[PDB]
Amino acid sequence: SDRVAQLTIGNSTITTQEAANIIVGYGEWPSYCSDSDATAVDKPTRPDVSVNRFYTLDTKLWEKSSKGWYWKFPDVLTETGVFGQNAQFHYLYRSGFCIHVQCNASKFHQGALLVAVLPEYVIGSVAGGTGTEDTHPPYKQTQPGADGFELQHPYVLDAGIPISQLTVCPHQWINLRTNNCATIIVPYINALPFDSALNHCNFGLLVVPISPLDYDQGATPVIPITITLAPMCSEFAGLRQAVTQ
Amino acid sequence: GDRVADVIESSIGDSVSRALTRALPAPTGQDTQVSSHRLDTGKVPALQAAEIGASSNASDESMIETRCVLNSHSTAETTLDSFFSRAGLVGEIDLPLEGTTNPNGYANWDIDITGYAQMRRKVELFTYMRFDAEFTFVACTPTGQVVPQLLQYMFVPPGAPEPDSRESLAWQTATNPSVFVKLSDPPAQVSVPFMSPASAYQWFYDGYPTFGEHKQEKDLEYGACPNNMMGTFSVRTVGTSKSKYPLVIRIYMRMKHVRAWIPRPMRNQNYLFKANPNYAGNFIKPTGASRTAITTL
Amino acid sequence: GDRVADVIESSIGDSVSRALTRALPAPTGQDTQVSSHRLDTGKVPALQAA
Amino acid sequence: SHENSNSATEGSTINYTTINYYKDSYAATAGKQSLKQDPDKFANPVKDIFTEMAAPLK
Amino acid sequence: SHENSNSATEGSTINYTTINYYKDSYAATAGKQSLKQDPDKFANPVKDIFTEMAAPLK
Amino acid sequence: SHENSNSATEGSTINYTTINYYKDSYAATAGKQSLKQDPDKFANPVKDIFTEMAAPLK
User: Fold this and answer.
1) What residue intervals traverse the membrane (chain C) (predicted)?
2) H or E segment to which residue F42 belongs
3) Where are the beta strands (DSSP E) in chain B?
4) Phi, psi of B169 (to 5 degrees)
5) CA B220, CA D47: separation in Å to the nearest integer?
6) Number of helices and strands in chain F (H, E)
7) Residue D40 is inside which H or E element, if any?
């Protein structure tokens, strides 16, 4: 009975009492991050629990002709909030996460969603769509902002990625039999210890409806899905002034 | 002194990557045997369902029974990680006496696994890797015979300037040792350790390996890093005795000291450049051929 | 000798017509009395719905 | 045999010695290794653990 | 000599060690083996065995 | 191994043996050596040493 959460900030909040349980990861111990291998030797700090709390970032709708969506991690909150300014003026970042997506369906509604968190994913961009003519994709698809971006082809994930072979990542189902909300757990993984928040892209989410949305005419056409995230025990290194360069 | 206890909430005991969950080791384990049908409780682990592992409140097998199977197979030496190499064509190059593709008399090729995607894509199924490599250069005639000529091999370490003439300074390569080989000696066989600047080779990586603001000018460095690479190899003929026969080389590749991570699934499409996510969208075809019906062929 | 135990699953103890259920006798029984309205637990068999 | 090595790769369960035809030392046979597998977390991410006697679900 | 083998062929009566010029181990001399023969069942398929003193046939 | 050497270079902390393909003896691997550094005199040429408790300067 450890599927509880105490959350209250701003003016509203969301907590659960009899939700769809949780998913455990790696069966492991708590720890901080490696400190005695950086370029410099200065002592680290610990920002603690100053600002880490949940604000929803988008309530994505699900419709009859949903084609797929995703996000860029951690580009979602790198530009907004005191966390945004801290990430902008600070070079090194690391923290854990507890992803909680709210996904409810009514008695009338039937269907399921294909929500897959894909780490380390080199993003499959539009790249001109065809890509045979050298017209480079503009910046309006590299830094979309809080809106995310629309993925082109589901069963190849814009990169040749056949759908049935996505099973490697933590796989989740959205069904009124299964869950009133889904939980995703991911720690901090990178092939290199230290990097900037503007050059390197870690990964992003992915959502493609595994089942088409259907309902007899007379019901709600779209289904909103809410997402929020708050990193737990966040620590930032490369402490410096408010200087981008 | 010791008055306030605000910070004591910490959880010292650092073991692995950041998280908050906790577990505990156990000294020994558990076992299970097999039996037949019986209505009893307490101890009944005989059968195992991978997810449920029990019987629902609606009976699954109330009508018939099951059977048993015995094992006689061994799995000790079935691992493939390093031994998965088998036969397959690899590739070749040529150094003719008179030609247009080689107006200089020497050939300098950039060393990489990006040689020929046909078989590299089999190894390219992963992203983060640590391995040993081997390069074999076998020399012969373009016709397919053997001729007693005078040849030798010079290595180009990374960071050295790329030769632009038959008499460049790159031939001295002071910090590069020398290998005593000749056409009479067995063909080239050189080991290559893991000198990646990072923990693994970067192919599926979205970033900017050059400092400064990112613009349309600085986009070609995807895959072809001018300096981050492990160098090239230059081949020519040294000495006053110039060869009177054109020559050809075949390049053989082999990998040792396997250590991999990050499983990445199979690709059913084609690229157009190195690590280019672009695909033939107008002619997408599934990974397998289907039929008008599944019942009959 | 006695090596395999495939057949030992049997349930010797033949009593009556073929079935698979099992029960057991008891030496004595139980009784019950009557009372009035009260809000209590533990022992309250006073009334019986079939 | 007055000679040591300059390698820091660990993960050996039995002590063993090596001899090389080159001047280095680790180029010989790497030795015999066992096989280990632990897929528990892959398919069973359950935090609430009951006792052996009790059923897992209510 | 920190090295084992990956062979499962049995039937040896004396312990022995092997050394190979290749990286494998069993390519050297297989060792000395004895000779065994037992043709009893081939020519004498008799189930009814009498005692040593008594004659075999009535 | 009834053979000695004709070398007088010292500075070894562990005893070790050598074998050579030539008739000489010291042409094989020289052995493993540690690293030592002592830059005290380079930057701290002070003759007047105070006790640990007292400050160095008046």
Assistant:
1) none
2) helix F40-43
3) 92-95, 107-110, 132-140, 152-155, 190-192, 232-236, 247-256
4) -65, -20
5) 48
6) 1, 0
7) helix D40-43
Which of E3, E7, E26 to mutate to probe the D interface, most D CBs <10 Å?
E3
Q: Which residues of B fall within a CB distance of 8 Å from D55?
A: 54
Determine the structural domain holding residue A115 and report its residue range.
5-239
Closest to A79 (Cα-Cα) out of A198, A196, A241? A198
Q: Write the DSSP assignment of A81-99 as a string of letters.
A: HHHHHHHHH-SEEEEE--E
Query: Would A245 be classed as within a structural domain?
Result: no
Measured CA to CA in angstroms, residue B25 lies from A27, A48, B22, B246 at distances of 10, 30, 11, 67
Retrieve residue A53's tokens.
Answer: 């709390």
**Per CATH, which fold does E1-58 belong to?**
Rhinovirus 14, subunit 4 (4.10.80)
**Partner A, chain D 34-53, Cβ-Cβ below 8 Å:** 40-41, 45-48
* Residue A99, phi then psi, degrees to nearest 5: -80, 125
> CA of F14: which chain D residue's CA is closest?
D2
- Subunit contact A131:B22, Cβ cutoff 8 A: no
Distances (CA, A) of B257 to B90, B132, B204: 20, 5, 22
Alpha-carbon distance A196 to nearest alpha carbon in chain D (angstroms): 30
Whole-Å CA distances, B70 to B6, B49, B67, B73, B239 = 61, 19, 11, 10, 70
Provide the residue type at A39 as one letter. Answer: T
**Cα dist. A178→A94, A106, A173, A201, E53 in Å?**
32, 13, 7, 32, 84
Q: Which two tokens stand for residue D4?
A: 């040591």
Cα nearest neighbour of F29 on chain D: D23
Nearest CA to CA, how far is B41 from chain C (Å)?
A: 14
Neighbours, chain C (3 or more CB pairs < 8 A): B
Q: Please tell me which of the candidates B15, B216, B268 has its beta carbon nearest to residue A162.
A: B268
Cβ neighbors of B114 (< 8 A, separation 6 or more) are B120, B223, B274
Calpha distance B247→A107 (Å, rounded): 77
Q: B53 contacts in D (CB within 8 Å)? A: 56
Q: What's this structure's resolution in Å?
A: 7.4
Nearest to A29 by CA among B20, D35, B168: B20
Tell me, yes or no, if B240 comes closer than 8 A to chain E by beta carbon. no
Question: Taking a C-beta distance cutoff of 8 angstroms, is the pair E9, E25 a contact?
Answer: no
Amino acid present at C16 = V
Return the domain boundaries, chain D: 1-58
Contact A20, A180 (CB under 8 A): yes
How many domains is chain A partitioned into structurally?
Answer: 1
E contacts of D16 (beta carbons < 8 Å): 1-3
Chain D residues bordering chain E (beta-carbon distance below 8 Å): 14-18, 29, 31-32
Q: How far is it, in rounded angstroms, from Cα F17 to Cα F12?
A: 12
CB atoms inside a 10 Å sphere around CB A156: 20
Find which of D29, D33, D35 to mutate to test the E interface (most E CBs within 10 Å of its CB): D29
Can you tell me the distance from the alpha carbon of B133 to that of B196, in angstroms, rounded to the nearest whole number?
A: 12
Q: How was this structure determined?
A: cryo-EM
C-alpha to C-alpha distances, D40 to A24, A26, D47, nearest whole angstrom = 11, 9, 12
Partners for A (CB, 8 Å, 3+ pairs)?
A: B, D
